[PDB]
Structures are given as structure tokens and as C-alpha cells.
Amino acid sequence: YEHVTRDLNPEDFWEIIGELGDGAFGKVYKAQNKETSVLAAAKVIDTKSEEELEDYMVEIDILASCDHPNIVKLLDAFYYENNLWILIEFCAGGAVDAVMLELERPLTESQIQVVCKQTLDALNYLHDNKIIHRDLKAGNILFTLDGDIKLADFGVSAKNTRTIQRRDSFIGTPYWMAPEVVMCETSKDRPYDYKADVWSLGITLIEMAEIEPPHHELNPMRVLLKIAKSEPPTLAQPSRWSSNFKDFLKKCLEKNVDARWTTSQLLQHPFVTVDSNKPIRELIAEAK
């Protein structure tokens, strides 16, 4: 497609150094550019056929089209011998959840503020560009060498740009057009669906405060039921946390979607009014 190379062996450009992880789409490798020495994470996805490339295209497009400091960039993509290779800028610190498990402790509040502030900048850019992440969690927030973060894994993300471009496309005099379509107040443009990411942000903040997300102790079969039945989760040990942390969470973890804050609103909250990554430089230094 637009961004996927054909007929070339990815391993004539990128050398596998080792393994970074392993998941449902296969193993993820640490790769090194044979010419430039630039590092990458290399997803290698077994495709049974060419039709399956369409399943992975929205993700590639999002990665190729985004240009933000807190979103990982696409370095290359190849289709070769029935595998889709996706090469993504390398984040040397790994995922936030992996750090917590290595150190066997949650992040401190000042650390959470930095991750939250930068993660929010990424989300706000996504939403501004009609992208819903849809799988925000600590496993998909990666640390850089320099103590910053980058949001990754757009594997189930939605990009409403072509939908919106087709939505506004009309010819002739539209006498029959609904006023909400006239006013650009269709679901594609309203905040409603994007706010699903704002809830996931709240859960991820509790996950960073407590190592594991709410309801981790339940039978997995019960978790969706629990989310539906229960009031929104709160920090297990609230005395440990500032009023600003607890207030921010309440703006995210709000079941009335209309009342839940947008990323735009959240950027003005004092919990994210920070501008030094030092608490994270301290963390990742200890993990090194």
C-alpha cells in the first residue's frame, strides 16, 4: 500500500539483535539498521494471505501519518515471504508496566504526572486528527532513553478521517439534510467516541499507582460485568495521593460520557501542569 514495501527482504536492511517481547500477533524483535545503526522494534506478523494486509493497514497509516513527539514513528514496513514487517522507532526504556514489574513497585505521583502529561499531549493530537487509540494502557506507553514517553500500539485504533471526508462529501442542494449533519454534529465530529480513551487514561493512571489495573484479582470472565455494575474505580489507598491526582481521575472516570472531560479540558488541569521529566529520568536510571 501507501507505506508497505514489496519484493525486498527486510533483513537486507534491518538486522535482528534479539527479542523485545512476544504476543498474539507473534514475537517483536529488536532490530538495527545495517546502514545507519538506528534501532527499531520489529513486529513480524504471519499473514496467511494478501487479503489480511487490510487488517493491518489502518495501524500502518496512523503510524506513518502522525507527527508528534509522544507518538512512535514508522521507520519501515515490508511484505515479504508471507510476513508483514512493521519497524517502529525504538524506545530504549520499554513499557511502563514492564518497569513496575522489574522494580516491583508502582510509579510515584510525580512520575505519574509526567507520564500523564505527555500521554495526554499524544491523545489530544490523536483526537484532533480524528484518531481513537482504543487500547490505552501502561503496556502501550514506552519510555525513551531521555526520560520521555511515546504512545504505541495502534493495532485496534480508529481513524475517522476518510469517514469524515466521505461524510461531508455531497453534491446538489441538500434540502433533506438533518440539522445535526448541517452543523457538523455527527458522531465522527462529536467528542463522544473519543472519550473512551479518556476513561482508559484514568484506569492506566490507577494501574501506574498500583502496578495492576482495577479488578485484576477477579476471574477475567467477571471483569466486564464488574465495570458495568460498579461505580468508577478509585485509588485503593487514597491518603497516599494528592487531591489533584484524585480530582483528575474523577474527570476521566465518569460514566456519564457527556460529563467526562475531553483531553482538551484535561490539559488545563493542575495535575498535568508540569514541564520537567526529571522524576522519570530518576526512575529509568534505576531500571538501567
Next chain:
Amino acid sequence: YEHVTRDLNPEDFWEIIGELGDGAFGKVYKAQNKETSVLAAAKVIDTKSEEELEDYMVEIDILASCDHPNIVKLLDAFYYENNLWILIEFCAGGAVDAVMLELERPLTESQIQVVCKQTLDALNYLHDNKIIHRDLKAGNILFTLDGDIKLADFGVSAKNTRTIQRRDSFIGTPYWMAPEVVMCETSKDRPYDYKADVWSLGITLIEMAEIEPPHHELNPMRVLLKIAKSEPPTLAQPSRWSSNFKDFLKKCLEKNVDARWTTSQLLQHPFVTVDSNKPIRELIAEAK
């Protein structure tokens, strides 16, 4: 694709008898099956390239996948010598707006009830199957030989089935999932976007009452502004029309989308509690 034939000349199966119409995508022909004598409307769309087939595929899929008495069926589709041919079951009476212009008068109320009732059955099926028509008007409601109607022109329709199938698709324990996604209350499933068709139904009813839709006298440049600024339109000569007609319109022509009725709710309204097409048989007989 799924439903488009390659490498065969459509005119070795279908004979053009004449022209039915002409619009932005070209002329529409009256066609006759050379073997069966079955009649069709034949859309013939000039495509500059193969990539353009994707623009027309949702429409073909909707036509091929729908099975309802009040929705036109796909008979064939061909890609040949750079044209996309779409053959659609023929409706011998033509469009409602064409009848009104031929007879130089609007429909009577009893006629409108029959068209409304059948059109609503079609819409309700569409919405049940996650399709938004998006271009409902009297020009896209066609009369059959027998005095029934069929809804046509899915050229800008939305089909949210693959979107919804991808929406519910998840692996692993979804600790971070928003409660509105948990409860299947995303925009794909909520009535909100489908209700745009319910507004267009209301306008189409006024169009059938008055030959032309509200604001037909304005500079076309002003129409969208007028829709936005104005209260919903009403029948110009309300003494001519029943309270049931006027009440039905108010349920459709409601700017508060949440307060506007669904097609499901409208099916229970007395304005559509009719079960004879005789008023339409009388109309189309005079037009013959």
C-alpha cells in the same frame, strides 16, 4: 469484488431499451435481460481507474446484501471497458417526484400514508442492519407496477457492520474498557446517527405534500444556513392535513436528536397504520 463481474460484456446479457434518467454519475438506462426478458435500471459509471471501484462498493454491497420488499434488489454488476454497470430491479412507475411533476400536483394524504408506511418499513430494516441511507428524498422512492414502493440510491449510504464487527473484536482481559463500550453504547450502536434518516423522512413527506421540499425558493447557497437558523419546517397549508400527519411530522422534524423518534417508535404511530396500497394504485393508474 464479492458482487462485481469481470471480463464479460454486460451487453451480452442485458439489452438497453432506452433511457430512464440522467445525473452526476451519468445516464441511467432501461435494460432488458436477453434471456429472461426481466427489466432493470442500468447505472453505467465511467471510472478513470480501478481504484475508483472502492467508491462504489458500499452501495453494491448494500444492494446485494439487503432482502426486503421495499428495497430495490441488485440483479447484476459488471466492470467492463472502464465502466461499472449496476443493474437494479426495475420499478415501472418511476420516482415519486417524477409522478408529481408529470401530474403537476402533490400526493393526497392517503397516498402519502402508504408511501410513508412502506418507506418506514425499508428504513427500519436498514437501521436494524446498521445501514444509514443518508439521501432519502422523493426522487429516491420508486413506484412498482402494483402500487408499492421501493427505496433506491444507496450511493452515499453508510454500512456500519464491518465497523461494528471490528469494534466488538478484542482479545485479552479488557481492564481499561470504557463502560459505554462495555454496554455496547458506542456511536455505531446508538440511534443517534441513524436518526438523520428520520429527519429526511419528514422533509420528504412535506415534499410529497407540496411537490417541492421546504426552502426550494431560496438561493441554494442559503439553504444549509436556513436549516440551521430556523425552527423545523411545517406544512404550508396546515388546514389541508390531518392532525395525525402533522403529529407524525413533529416526531421526525425535531432538532433535539435524542427527542426525535426512531423508525421503531414511528411504526407504532397512527399515521402509518394502513395496509392497502389502493390510493397509490389510483395514482399510478392516472400517470399511466
